[PDB]
């Protein structure tokens, strides 16, 4: 029964909710268990990076997030092809590969191609046989530099280009931003009915 002024509420408690209640008393225990597994995995895979293989830069979709980049699932086959890395070899040396991803633009492709090349320079490759090295990193390089890289490999950061202050030209001062948007919307809205009418008069005249 409502009483005086209040919000109309519809609590979703008409089923046997008490039978399905997930408590979180094992949350501290879960965090401990995940931590120990991370540490155990890192010791097992040393000196390979603890977080995992390197991931590519990808741009988040939709208008809400296209201004930001993040780590992708894996490098595309085109990116690996340009970088000169066989897709089968990439996984063994710590490069994630995503055959599903396609590069729509060349800016994204070059960003990840550069990321792969810069990763390859940073990579220290131990010989399969310690006594015999063929094309692996130098003994000196392996002996000292090799250490387990903690945290994401080459974290993906949103870079912002600084734009220095400048004198406003006459053209910029005369640019009508509001009217440009208003007409651009109408041009897109009426483009078809204009193509229909313009076409319709064409056979009318001819």
Partner 1 sequence: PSRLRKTRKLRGHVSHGHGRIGKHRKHPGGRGNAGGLHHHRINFDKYHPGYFGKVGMKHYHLKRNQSFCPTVNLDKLWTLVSEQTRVNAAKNKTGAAPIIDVVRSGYYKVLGKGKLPKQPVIVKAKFFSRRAEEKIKSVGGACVLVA
Partner RNA sequence: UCAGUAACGGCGAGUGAACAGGGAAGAGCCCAGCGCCGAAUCCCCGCCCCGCGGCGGGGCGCGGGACAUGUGGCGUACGGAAGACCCGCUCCCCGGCGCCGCUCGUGGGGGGCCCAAGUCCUUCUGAUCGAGGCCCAGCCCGUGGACGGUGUGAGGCCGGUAGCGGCCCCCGGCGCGCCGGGCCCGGGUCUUCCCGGAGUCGGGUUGCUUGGGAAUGCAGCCCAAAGCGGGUGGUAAACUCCAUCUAAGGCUAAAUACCGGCACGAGACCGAUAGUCAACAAGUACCGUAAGGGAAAGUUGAAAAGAACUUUGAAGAGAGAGUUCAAGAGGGCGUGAAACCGUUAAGAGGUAAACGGGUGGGGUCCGCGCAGUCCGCCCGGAGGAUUCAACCCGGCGGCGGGUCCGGCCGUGUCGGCGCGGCGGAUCUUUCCCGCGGGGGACCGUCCCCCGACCGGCGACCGGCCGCCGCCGGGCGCAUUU
Partner RNA sequence: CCACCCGACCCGUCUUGAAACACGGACCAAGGAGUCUAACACGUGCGCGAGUCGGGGGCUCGCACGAAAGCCGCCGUGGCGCAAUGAAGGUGAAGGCCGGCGCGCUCGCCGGCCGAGGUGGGAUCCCGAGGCCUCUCCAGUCCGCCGAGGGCGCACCACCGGCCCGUCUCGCCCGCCGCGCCGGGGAGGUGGAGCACGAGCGCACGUGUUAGGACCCGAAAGAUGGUGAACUAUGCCUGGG
Partner RNA sequence: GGCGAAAGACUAAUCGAACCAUCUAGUAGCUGGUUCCCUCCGAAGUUUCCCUCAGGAUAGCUGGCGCUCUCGCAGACCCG
Partner RNA sequence: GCCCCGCGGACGCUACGCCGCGACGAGUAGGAGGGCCGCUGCGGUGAGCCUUGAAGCCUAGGGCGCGGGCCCGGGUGGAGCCGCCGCAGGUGCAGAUCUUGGUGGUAGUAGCAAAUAUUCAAACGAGAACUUUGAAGGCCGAAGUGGAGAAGGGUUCCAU
Within residues 37-76, the interface with partner 1 by CB under 8 A covers 62-65, 67
Listed in sequence order, the residues at least 6 apart from 50 whose beta carbon sits closer than 8 Å to its beta carbon are 38, 41, 42, 148, 149, 150, 151
173 sits near RNA (criterion: CB under 7 A): no
12 sits near partner 1 (criterion: CB under 8 A): no
In whole angstroms, give the CA distance from residue 78 to residue 60.
20
Within residues 131-150, the interface with RNA by CB under 7 A covers 131-132, 134
In whole angstroms, give the CA distance from residue 107 to residue 138.
34
88 sits near partner 1 (criterion: CB under 8 A): no
CB neighbourhood size of 70 (10 A): 13
43 binds, among RNA, partner 1, none (CB under 5 to 8 A by kind): RNA
**Which residue in 105, 106, 158, 169 binds RNA (CB under 7 A)?**
158
195 sits near RNA (criterion: CB under 7 A): no
**Which residue in 67, 86, 122, 148 binds RNA (CB under 7 A)?**
86
* Binding string, residues 59-78; x marks residues near RNA by CB under 7 A: -xxx-xx--x-xx-xx--x-
Q: For residues 153 and 54, is the Cβ–Cβ distance under 8 A?
A: yes
Let me know the angle formed at the C-alpha of 175 by 174 and 176, rounded to the nearest 5 degrees.
Answer: 110
**Which residue in 140, 144, 165, 202 binds RNA (CB under 7 A)?**
165
3-state SS assignment for residue 59: strand
């Amino acid at each position: 029964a409502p009483s005086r002024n209040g919000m109309v509420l519809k609590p979703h408690f008409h089923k046997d909710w008490q039978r399905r209640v997930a408590t979180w008393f094992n949350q501290p225990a879960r965090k401990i268990r995940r931590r120990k597994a991370r540490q155990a995995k890192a010791r097992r895979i040393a000196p390979r990076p603890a977080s995992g293989p390197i991931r590519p830069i990808v741009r988040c979709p939709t208008v809400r997030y296209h201004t930001k980049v993040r780590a992708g699932r894996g490098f595309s086959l085109e990116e690996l092809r340009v970088a000169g890395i066989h897709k089968k070899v990439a996984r063994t040396i710590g490069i994630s590969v995503d055959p599903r991803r396609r590069n729509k633009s060349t800016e994204s492709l070059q960003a990840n191609v550069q990321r792969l090349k810069e990763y390859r320079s940073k990579l220290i490759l131990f010989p399969r046989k310690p006594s015999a090295p063929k094309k692996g990193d130098s003994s000196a390089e392996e002996l000292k530099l090799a250490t387990q890289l903690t945290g994401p490999v080459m974290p993906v950061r949103n870079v912002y280009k600084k734009e220095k202050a400048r004198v406003i030209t006459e053209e910029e001062k005369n640019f009508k931003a509001f009217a440009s948007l208003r007409m651009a919307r109408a041009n897109a809205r009426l483009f078809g009915i204009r193509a229909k009418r313009a076409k319709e008069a064409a056979e009318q005249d001819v």
